[PDB]
Design a protein around this nucleic acid. Sequence first.
RNA 1: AUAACUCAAUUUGUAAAAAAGUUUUAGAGCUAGAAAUAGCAAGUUAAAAUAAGGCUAGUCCGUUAUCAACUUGAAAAAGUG
DNA 2: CAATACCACAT
DNA 3: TGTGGTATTG
DNA 4: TTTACAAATTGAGTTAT
Length: 1310
Amino acid sequence: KYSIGLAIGTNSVGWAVITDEYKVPSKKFKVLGNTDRHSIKKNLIGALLFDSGETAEATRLKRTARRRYTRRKNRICYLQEIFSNEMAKVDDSFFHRLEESFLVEEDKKHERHPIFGNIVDEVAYHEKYPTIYHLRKKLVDSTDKADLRLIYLALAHMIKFRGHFLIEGDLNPDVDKLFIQLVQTYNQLFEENPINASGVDAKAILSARLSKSRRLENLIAQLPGEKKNGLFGNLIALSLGLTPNFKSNFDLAEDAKLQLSKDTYDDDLDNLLAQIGDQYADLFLAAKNLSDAILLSDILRVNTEITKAPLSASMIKRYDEHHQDLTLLKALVRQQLPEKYKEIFFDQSKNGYAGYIDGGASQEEFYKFIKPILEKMDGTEELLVKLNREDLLRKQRTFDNGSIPHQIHLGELHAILRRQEDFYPFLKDNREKIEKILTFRIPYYVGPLARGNSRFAWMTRKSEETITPWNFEEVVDKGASAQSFIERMTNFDKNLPNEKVLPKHSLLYEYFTVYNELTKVKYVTEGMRKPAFLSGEQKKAIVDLLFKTNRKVTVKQLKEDYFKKIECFDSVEISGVEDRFNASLGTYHDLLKIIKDKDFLDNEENEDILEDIVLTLTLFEDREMIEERLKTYAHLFDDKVMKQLKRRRYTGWGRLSRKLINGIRDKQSGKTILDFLKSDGFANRNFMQLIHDDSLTFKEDIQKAQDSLHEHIANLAGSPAIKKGILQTVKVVDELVKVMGRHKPENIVIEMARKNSRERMKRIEEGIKELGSQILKEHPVENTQLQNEKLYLYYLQNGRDMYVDQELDINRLSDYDVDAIVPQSFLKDDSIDNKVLTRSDKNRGKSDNVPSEEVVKKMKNYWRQLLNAKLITQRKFDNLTKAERGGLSELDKAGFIKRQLVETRQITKHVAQILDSRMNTKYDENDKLIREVKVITLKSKLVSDFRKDFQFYKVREINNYHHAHDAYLNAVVGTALIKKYPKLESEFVYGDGKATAKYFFYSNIMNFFKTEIKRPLIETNGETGEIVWDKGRDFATVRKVLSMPQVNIVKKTEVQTGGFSKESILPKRNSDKLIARKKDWDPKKYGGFDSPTVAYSVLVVAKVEKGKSKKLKSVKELLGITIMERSSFEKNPIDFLEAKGYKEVKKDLIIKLPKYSLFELENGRKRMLASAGELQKGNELALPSKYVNFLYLASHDNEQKQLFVEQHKHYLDEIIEQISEFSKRVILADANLDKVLSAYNKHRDKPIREQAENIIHLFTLTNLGAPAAFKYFDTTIDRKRYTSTKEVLDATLIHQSITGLYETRIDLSQ
RNA sequence: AUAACUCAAUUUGUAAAAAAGUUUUAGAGCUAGAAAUAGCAAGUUAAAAUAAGGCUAGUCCGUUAUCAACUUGAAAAAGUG
DNA sequence: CAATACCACAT
DNA sequence: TGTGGTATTG
DNA sequence: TTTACAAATTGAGTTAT
Ligand SMILES: [Mg+2]
Ligand SMILES: [Mg+2]
Ligand SMILES: [Mg+2]
Ligand SMILES: [Mg+2]
Ligand SMILES: [Mg+2]
Ligand SMILES: [Mg+2]
Ligand SMILES: [Mg+2]
Ligand SMILES: [Mg+2]
């Protein structure tokens, strides 16, 4: 009798129930509660609205951050535990004064001076050591016995802020020396062409406070005849961290683009060295050393002979220069600009020095502020120099201190320890412990050090001790933990669920893939009558001769190196492979280079060992653990080979198990899968064939070897946002089925709807850096500007036209065109992968196909460079260069057209599968599923085109009815479509030359709805004779459906979860709004948190005390239970409320009111709950469809539409009138309404288009939900909010179901 | 539709770390003046917290997902037009 | 108890 | 971007 | 901000059921 339509969105689920003739039923639903109404008429159509589901990312970031905090705290505690006794001998309450430092003097139990406990000593301390780095340097250099408190402070400062762990190994803090060395190996390599490095201040030039490229040019400038693109230039460029290409230097065909910071460099340099010889290794190694020294120079900037604490010394340098420059600046301003002195050095709000030190002004804002001040005055040259160097008035605690490796802090710490262990025995006994505190870091593969109470943890214990940084290796089983870290996420074999999947880089796996590909290769010559398979001996010969000698095997190599060389074929045609074999024996060649023993790799005896080695290299990344793991094979290789093997690492896992590939044997033949791949007589059967061959036992053994709704949906691959919509739509379906007397629908039609700036800046920066372009220096940009499409494309294309090979102009983007690579008529693609910036789209070639072969031939190399720079992707490149591959065939066109209507997205198939499995649960006599309900999936294009073709227009901003309407139209169009063409069930319904005809078929699939294109008035199916669409009275029914005033729009009520409040840590203030950041931290003294989020409001009817005499006064109000107060409130509501000051609370009348709780008042006026003290608009404006269609037409053959607009231009006043009466009845914002009316009467002179487009904006005043601001024309109208929830307390509360069909109304008069 | 492989891109989930920021306190402000106020000096650093907190007491957990109302029922979850 | 202006997040 | 919290003004 | 890892998914290809 009925079908269901569904529109699944990220914030909405549209639903509709239709009958045989495409009508939606209306029904009487019972109404519960204590009101007058016992029932209500409802149309079976509506939409569920809900806030977006969130990812788990934020939660994760905060969790991990938390752990970082507690662990840092623990580091400090370990340090204090070590210092405890001796400190107790020295200062009885040092640590106590330290711990209560935050407390006000009134709350302190000890002296207010932390370090020493008295004024004179404290002042003396700060006098001698103005910064902590002074004390650090002092404790590093001096040999005098020092106060244990200062020692502690230094060690603790180094431990609390230890620096990163991005660099492995030890660091011993030079550039001149390694430069002279570089010149040395270079000149010793190139005897004929030497370089004069006399008088070349390499230290000052390379360690300069400038960009790497500029420094490169500066260095090259001192070298006559040497250019930056030359070899030495590329070496220095390597040391500076650029991306040089050593191809041009060594006459290579393979580009030697190598970046030092890139993780693949260590193998790239081997790939390069294998081509130019091993003589050049010294050179590049030198270059790397010089690079390390350069980075260290970036951090330190202080000579190493002066002190063993270059970092602290550098900070002290910052301090001294800050002092000198401050004195200078103050004097200068005193002399020349006396009026600006107060503004600069006294006002914290003006971003001057005062704002820079005491205010919230950053270093950048401060440099921005004094820039024209320094420019205007005289004697401020060097200050400007430092300002552009970002080296002026620098603090010691700065954003760019993230460069600091932990090794140097460790160096200072070790120095201080070695210095003071001469006087304190406990420092000698605890030296390595203290060092380990700073050093130790829980491995990422171990995870949280839990004991059975963490859902995130996985680590295994080797013992039951309390884990400390010192006993970590003994208590924690690092091996089992690291193994679990990977194995808990990796797939088992689908075919053999109890079998682990092989490493992707396994030798056996690679043999499998190579043989599997090779088996389906066929060849024909002049003498043969038919292409033949490769036999076993041929495959083995090809493997041994080609696959085991070449990294990659091309077709040319197959023909010439095998078919000519072994078979004596001058000509042969190959069918199995394209250009080159996709599969390869990469690991074989890696291990061949490492161990240098081919016979060892070819020996079948060593198979297990090699598999184990590759497994070790894959499963782990820690070189130490890898080394320990490979110890059993140390007797097989030399130590050098062992270290080379150590360096070798792999990532990633296969898809199949070893037992599948080469374990299970066929019962009759005794052959494994791989055995069949190597040799299978006449029929070279595939893995797919082997797996499904009834004459073999593989299928048998595999078949023999072989989660709630919420969990199932959660386990799907996709954004949680759409997943929420999926669960919701399933629940909606369930309820609709309940509504229809538990009768299942005939059909269910489902349709599924289709920061970044930083990523864009990153892509452009790395791309330009790869390209070695100057366009970024010449044309600087901000990430916010990259939101613009043409500008982003401009930078992605290096400021060049993508079709013509010419530069473009930034100021001329408005004149340029954004062309689609593959035409939008075939591919509805809006992404960058299909868009391109060109001067004129005419220059792309023909407008019917991919850019012409002419363009492809002109721009292939440029596109190659853009590809290698990651500025364009592989897909974009292939789409750009398709013309040389025949362009778009008619089959491709037909495919595109059918894909415009047929849903291929996996997530939608999952939705359809869920629904189908929930509705169809019965089997027939042949044990086959009975499909009572057909689940149809359509794309949005069908309904959209349907709306455009029959003028059932959609305007989203008018109300939320369009979701419901979309669902309805989905049901109608879908049911009609399958009824008209039952053959198309295979395409649209879930469950189990000619291309031109297919193209035209799918291009005119929706023609049966039209009367002329010339078709009959009544459309029916040919075989059944069943009428599918009556063009005379069906559109009428649809029109009546969309014109229906009442539509069940239901805003999902949700308890608010997440952060307690705003994260902002506000200064002290006299307000009860402030929340204590800790239990005993009175926010009036210490400041604290503000703006908490209400989890859900609560209706309280009780009595409160009034006046000095506390007279009990009966009250009824809404109390917002915050997220923080929630657990306490739910543990015992009565105690909570009574603690809030309420008395005699009516427990039974306590009503939980989550956000978006619906209330109805007098004139059908509705309000939703935004909070405990704010309301939202709860009504929908059911604007008549005539006005909607008119708005659509006016805001955007065409002449008839224009004539309709001009003939019905009186509709404007009518629409304004509708909005007006609706606003007077429901919105109740007369001021804003008056502003609207006035603004409308102001721009009555404006063209109809503009007035329509601006009338569109007016609906935000009447829109359901939170009030928002909107501009009519140039008149901005601020939102009028509802800052009082008092009126709701006497209104009628409406409890709605997911569909809103079942209601319980409670008259809050009590 | 499904499977394996190649290349690339995207998305989801997890772990270990870093640099800041903020907030109170500690860095004897000096004079003149009865008084606010006036002139000048000065500033770069540190401690501590970084969701309140919890019991399971771990170098653990605390911001995702999920949620009409009623009837039951401790609870889970069923039932109700 | 209006209009109304500012704030967050920025790791 | 939004929208609920907050203080200011009145 | 950095590093390490796994899984789907899309979509251009080779081979199959
Ligand atoms: Mg804590
Ligand atoms: Mg030169
Ligand atoms: Mg600071
Ligand atoms: Mg190929
Ligand atoms: Mg590995
Ligand atoms: Mg939630
Ligand atoms: Mg800080
Ligand atoms: Mg509801």
